[PDB]
């Protein structure tokens with residue numbers, strides 16, 4: 619069961635990546651936005667200390683929220699929403715990705 | 727230091743007030759309304775579409 623769904627999903631995903639040269643750029647950005655959050659929590663687990671807690675929480679929020687806006691751009695960029703073009707999803711990505719950096723520079 | 731009923735008096739001021747500046751108040755309001763409509767004219771007719 620899971621072998622068939624596994625190899626089916628690997629092949630049907632890798633063909634989709636090799637078709638469009640926009641998708642591997644998104645996913646290459648995404649994976650290293652996961653590794654930033656992982657080692658940034660590893661600093662907390664390594665030495666037991668919790669003192670500048672807001673400065674901990676700001677970078678972690680940058681990693682998670684910045685991951686999510688990429689996944690929304692990917693979902694909206696493969697299949698188009700009814701009424702929204704592909705020139706407007708990108709501008710909304712710029713504006714809403716540009717508010718979040720300011721409110722995570724005030725917070726540290 | 728001056729008291730109620732013994733220092734009442736008057737005070738006299740002489741001044742001038744031309745017919746030019748008598749009519750400047752409604753032209754001041756009217757110039758702010760006129761410079762307020764043109765912002766709606768420029769703001770309304772200006773291209774902001776991102777599609778073609």
Ligand SMILES: CCCCCCCCCCCCCC(=O)O[C@H](COC(=O)CCCCCCCCCC)COP(=O)(O)OCC[N+](C)(C)C
Nearest residue numbers: 701702703706708709710712713714716774775776777778
């Ligand atoms: C929190 C709110 C702050 C927003 C500040 C910008 C205010 C823009 C106000 C737009 C007024 C509505 C008019 C409009 O529709 O323009 C939007 C406009 O689409 C956009 O949203 C793009 C605006 C951003 C431009 C990109 C530059 C980056 C801005 C600096 C951070 C584009 O959508 P449209 O092009 O109209 O969609 C297709 C055309 N139809 C006929 C189908 C409608």
